[PDB]
Design a protein around this nucleic acid. Structure first.
Ligand SMILES: [Mg+2]
Ligand SMILES: [Mg+2]
Ligand SMILES: [Mg+2]
Ligand SMILES: [Mg+2]
Ligand SMILES: [Mg+2]
Ligand SMILES: [Mg+2]
Ligand SMILES: [Mg+2]
Ligand SMILES: [Mg+2]
Ligand SMILES: [Mg+2]
Ligand SMILES: [Mg+2]
Ligand SMILES: [Mg+2]
Ligand SMILES: [Mg+2]
Ligand SMILES: [Mg+2]
Ligand SMILES: [Mg+2]
Ligand SMILES: [Mg+2]
Ligand SMILES: [Mg+2]
Ligand SMILES: [Mg+2]
Ligand SMILES: [Mg+2]
Ligand SMILES: [Mg+2]
Ligand SMILES: [Mg+2]
Lengths: 203, 147, 210, 102
RNA sequence: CGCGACCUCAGAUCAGACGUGGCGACCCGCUGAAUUUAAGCAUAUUAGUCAGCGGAGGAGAAGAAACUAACCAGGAUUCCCUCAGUAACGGCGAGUGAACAGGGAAGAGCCCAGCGCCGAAUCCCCGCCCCGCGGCGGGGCGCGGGACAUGUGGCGUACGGAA
RNA sequence: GGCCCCCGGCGCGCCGGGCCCGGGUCUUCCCGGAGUCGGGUUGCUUGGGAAUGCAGCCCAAAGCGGGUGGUAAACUCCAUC
């Protein structure tokens, strides 16, 4: 089936074909606003593996994000404090750019419920992304049982809480020895557990 | 029981048992184990010889259960079994010798402290001492390795 | 400041711990709540064991625990396959099934098949309607018990096989255990180099020809 | 002469009979399928090769094959990936050489 | 020099929907000190703690192994007891500091993309009738619109699956 | 203990629809998520120590592959996802 071809082609990103296209796409995207609703998914394939479905009430915003790290917002330098914390230039945000991308798509379209995102290119200055969104109150989603989990109000603002695939990754949770921080729910919760004087009745 | 404590008997007296030349100030030494090298050194190196310094090899992902090997002495090996195995034996007249599975009772190694009574055995165990073996043989028994 | 002899001891009360003290005044109230909730769940699953489903027998890991045996999480697929219970159905008759369990040795497998067989013997499957089709048991074994089973269903008891008094053949007596262990240690230690020197010597014998 | 099972040394541990079950289906992942192979190489004649790959082919042609690997390791990352790539490149280069000779 | 497809884009007080603020004990994501300790202090510590911003729910988060182990092996997540003030970190000073096993509380497991087969077999909105209507649903009937082949629905997902 | 309201929850009947929904045995086919993994790096973070986890930047994959197997690397068997 064509999707497997498309998939394998897109892995040849250093190839002559895909490099040509990526350059032309990235030029084109750069010549638009920072947030615009793509009429259809640039990457159909990827979108399907991430859970897009080509029916009504699935949406896709292409969102630009400025690239590079995070300089410490303090006037001049003047991070007054112990010279551990004197750093301002070479320091780096916890979440990814892709998460930031989703978060912004989420912010803008409050009714819409961020499902998942994928990449469409990168300049020196910008990255580009494509956030799949969903109306939780369009009948075609509501009545389809397999999606109607997103219409539940626990799934409000997934991206804001660190719950999309992208913003999950910063949280630092997976099974096995390479984690332990996040061995309750999350990073914060384990610390909480580990720094509770459990003070029993009888002692 | 505050009733019994010392502050009840100190009521009335000025200094509260802390003296009046020197007082009860907050932290005159430094907090805690401060000064281990300087200014508390003598206490450290006459009641904790060897506090300071590294020694030996690091071992990163220590898991204690690998090195699990609870020992038992010949001293009290017969304790593992009901008296009537040690009694139906020194009797019987077959020269039978009853088995003692030490690993069942929760000891892996059998070390050799103590006098073993002149009364044959078959000791099943994961590990043995040299002496524990020897004593067992001298009783007229047989050590038996188990996985 | 330390004064004459004592453990040079490190307490961990430097963070704001009184902000995170966790009292246990619940616990009685808790213990009850669980207990009510427990009795409710029994009553809901009416003649079904209060326990839960049946669970496999399983040995612990590590040299330490090794000798003991617990209840496992669920019966493997091979064990269901050999017993002849369709895995999707086994859930519906109160048989725990995990499918992530390997099955290394055949001693642990046949035991766990035996478990399921025994379960299926002493199980009282009620028919779907009061009108009785196949599988569903007789109204005798139904009226005589729509009874719950208190406690864990067919409990595992870690058990020992009594060894009778032998005679000690002149061979057991001959054995030198401690030595044997020392030897067995050194051969694991030295296996690998010995093989490298032999590989060296073999190369020297072949090199002599050419 | 009496071979008690031991808890320590080479053929150690509790002696138990082994069943030889069907290996889990999870274990066969990454096995190259006839149809996937066809797709993979169907695309290597559309898309062609990357720049670093091409540069390595040119090294391999010259028979300077250590420098080829030194390059691929710095480029790809590991040794084992670099070595596996160098074999593919040498295979490609050979099938060109066979194709030319006709 | 028109008319017609589509593509990409606009504008509507267009028809019908949703989002905005609050609360914040508990919860998720960021951000993030300095008093303080070290008898001084800069790494360390205080602390991923206070303050700061964001977003929730009746709980949240987590969760059905790219896991543990190295055993005769265990088998999602969470919680307690233990592991253990231990392995480890550390001007190896002050200080800091987990995990597996073991025993419990509870216990529940599943679905896509893909790969394939099936006349798109699917969905939304209109309009007419019968029931039902204070959580807008059922059934029928319309050459009544649209979405959709740049892929909807049934079967199926590694515990194998299809024919 | 009683009576009266209301509401819930479960039991039986009727109708309206939907719904022709198994298992084993042998054969022939089918099979996996990329700017991701991985590497280098710098900064934070961790008990995690020749890098526990998260980041930016650069490189940038494979398919008997990939990941893990708590000391860097090469060769090699195993185990485990
Ligand atoms: Mg500091
Ligand atoms: Mg990652
Ligand atoms: Mg005094
Ligand atoms: Mg005074
Ligand atoms: Mg004084
Ligand atoms: Mg229970
Ligand atoms: Mg709000
Ligand atoms: Mg100070
Ligand atoms: Mg001071
Ligand atoms: Mg000062
Ligand atoms: Mg800290
Ligand atoms: Mg706060
Ligand atoms: Mg939840
Ligand atoms: Mg997973
Ligand atoms: Mg666990
Ligand atoms: Mg202790
Ligand atoms: Mg700390
Ligand atoms: Mg499909
Ligand atoms: Mg730190
Ligand atoms: Mg090693």
């Amino acid at each position: 089936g064509a999707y497997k071809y498309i998939q394998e082609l897109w892995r040849k990103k250093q190839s002559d074909v895909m490099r040509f296209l990526l350059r032309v796409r990235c030029w084109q995207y750069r010549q638009l606003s920072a947030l615009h609703r793509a009429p259809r998914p640039t990457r159909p394939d990827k979108a399907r593996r991430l859970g897009y479905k080509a029916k009504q009430g699935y949406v896709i915003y292409r969102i630009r994000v400025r690239r590079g790290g995070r300089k410490r917002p303090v006037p001049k330098g003047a991070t007054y404090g112990k010279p551990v914390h004197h750093g301002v230039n070479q320091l780096k945000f916890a979440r990814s750019l892709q998460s930031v991308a989703e978060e912004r798509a989420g912010r803008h379209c409050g009714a819409l419920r961020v499902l998942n995102s994928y990449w469409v290119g990168e300049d020196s200055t910008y990255k580009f992304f494509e956030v799949i969104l969903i109306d939780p109150f369009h009948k075609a989603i509501r009545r389809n049982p397999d999606t109607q989990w997103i219409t539940k109000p626990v799934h409000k603002h997934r991206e804001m809480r660190g719950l999309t695939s992208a913003g999950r990754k910063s949280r630092g949770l997976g099974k096995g020895h390479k984690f332990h921080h996040t061995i309750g729910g999350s990073r914060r919760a384990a610390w909480r557990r580990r720094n509770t004087l459990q003070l029993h009745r009888y002692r | 029981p505050s009733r019994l404590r010392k502050t009840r008997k100190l009521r009335g007296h000025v200094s509260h048992g802390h003296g009046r030349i020197g007082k009860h100030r907050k932290h005159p030494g430094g907090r805690g184990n401060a000064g281990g090298m300087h200014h508390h050194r003598i206490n450290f190196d006459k009641y904790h010889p060897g506090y300071f310094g590294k020694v030996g090899m690091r071992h990163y992902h220590l898991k204690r259960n690998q090195s699990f090997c609870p020992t038992v002495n010949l001293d009290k090996l017969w304790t593992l079994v009901s008296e009537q195995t040690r009694v139906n034996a020194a009797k019987n007249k077959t020269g039978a010798a009853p088995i003692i599975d030490v690993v069942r009772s929760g000891y892996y190694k059998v070390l050799g402290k103590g006098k073993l009574p002149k009364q044959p055995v078959i000791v099943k165990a994961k590990f043995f001492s040299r002496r524990a073996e020897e004593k067992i043989k001298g009783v007229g028994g047989a050590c038996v390795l188990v996985a | 400041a330390p004064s004459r002899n004592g453990m040079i001891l490190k307490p961990h009360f430097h963070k704001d711990w009184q902000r995170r003290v966790a009292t246990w005044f619940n616990q009685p109230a808790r213990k009850i709540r669980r207990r009510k909730a427990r009795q409710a769940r029994a009553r809901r699953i009416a003649p079904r064991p209060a326990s839960g489903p049946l669970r496999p027998i399983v040995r612990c890991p590590t040299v330490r625990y090794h000798t003991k045996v617990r209840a496992g999480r669920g019966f493997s697929l091979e064990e269901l396959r050999v017993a002849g219970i369709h895995k999707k159905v086994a859930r519906t008759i109160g048989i725990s099934v995990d499918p992530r369990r390997r099955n290394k040795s055949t001693e642990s497998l046949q035991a766990n098949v035996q478990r399921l067989k025994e379960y299926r013997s002493k199980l009282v499957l009620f028919p779907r309607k009061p009108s009785a089709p196949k599988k569903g048991d007789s109204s005798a074994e139904e009226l005589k018990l729509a009874t719950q089973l208190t406690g864990p269903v067919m409990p595992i008891r870690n058990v020992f096989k009594k060894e009778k008094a032998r005679v000690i053949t002149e061979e057991e007596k001959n054995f030198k255990a401690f030595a044997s262990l020392r030897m067995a240690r050194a051969n694991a230690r030295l296996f690998g180099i010995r093989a490298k020197r032999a590989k060296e010597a073999a190369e020297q014998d072949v090199e002599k020809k050419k | 002469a009496l071979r008690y099972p031991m808890a320590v040394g080479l053929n150690k541990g509790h002696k138990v009979t082994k069943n030889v079950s069907k290996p889990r289906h999870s274990r066969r992942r990454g096995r190259l399928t006839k149809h996937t192979k066809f797709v993979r190489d169907m695309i290597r004649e559309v898309c062609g090769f990357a720049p670093y790959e091409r540069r390595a082919m040119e090294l391999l042609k010259v028979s300077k094959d250590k420098r080829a690997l030194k390059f691929i390791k710095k480029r790809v990352g590991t040794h084992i990936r670099a070595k596996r790539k160098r074999e593919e490149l040498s295979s490609v280069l050979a099938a060109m050489r066979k194709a030319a000779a006709k």
